[PDB]
Amino acid sequence: ESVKEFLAKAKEDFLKKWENPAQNTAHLDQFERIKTLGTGSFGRVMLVKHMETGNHYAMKILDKQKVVKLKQIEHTLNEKRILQAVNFPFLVKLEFSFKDNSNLYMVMEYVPGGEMFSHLRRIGRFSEPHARFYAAQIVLTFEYLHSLDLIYRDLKPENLLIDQQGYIQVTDFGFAKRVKGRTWTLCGTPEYLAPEIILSKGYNKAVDWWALGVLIYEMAAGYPPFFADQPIQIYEKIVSGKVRFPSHFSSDLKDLLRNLLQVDLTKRFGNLKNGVNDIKNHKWFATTDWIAIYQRKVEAPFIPKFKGPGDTSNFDDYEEEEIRVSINEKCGKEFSEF
């Protein structure tokens, strides 16, 4: 019940920032471009150095015109408004946000450790205790987000960074949305999509718990529960209602996954009467000290190699591209509140 006490205070803090979001807290010329850490349809993330403090940050640059073409205006506004309002040990903090004639900018704490994806693929798979450590942090993070009426909708190793302490840092709130009712947007990542999303149904926060099942599976197995060469083939497997576990999977783990990867919403863990407690009290988490996890007092199974505050060895290489700023303002009305 001390959790309710914590969540109560947490919601008070969130709501004040949610209703009065911070805007224009920095300028581009206050940062030094160093290296591109990632790129996508929109947009790109770069390692930057804040001259005033000497601190290194991860700066995402979004081309406003490209955001409009992809019809991601509202989603982008969601992301920024939510990020500036949230506060949790396993969520990357948004330090600054601003915009110019051409681009939108979000400056967050840099995590040299790299993505879980990279470490998972290289090592092959995590031991159950190793996967349990990460899973526990996601469980607490979702408990926090959901209590604020927030749905995440993009859980995957690619969006999970490993800090110097070996703990998880959740990134990419591109599809994050505050909603109390049901929602309908087709979004996420194929391997992690819940059946109700694929079937174009009205869904809720239960999709995040399904994604957790996929994450835990992939961490412990080394591969997703549903994989193929094409997304369409993946969707067929997801809606089939069948799943196969590796022989090394423990009985407790398989039981937990059958409850998370449950097509029936009236039976899926995290969406029942007991809520998240059905997960936190499961046998697979019997050895998990939730308070110790939150307080970061638990010893991490893996610590990334540190080579400096601005080291990028733990990240792959990407093609560098100019940061062009038009002389004319683009999409002014669309991103007025950003």
Partner: peptide, 20 residues
Amino acid sequence: TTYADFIASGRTGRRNAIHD
């Protein structure tokens, strides 16, 4: 093996998000 099948698939790299 399932592992071999995954490693030989075209989706072992970073996976992009999808949307309408």
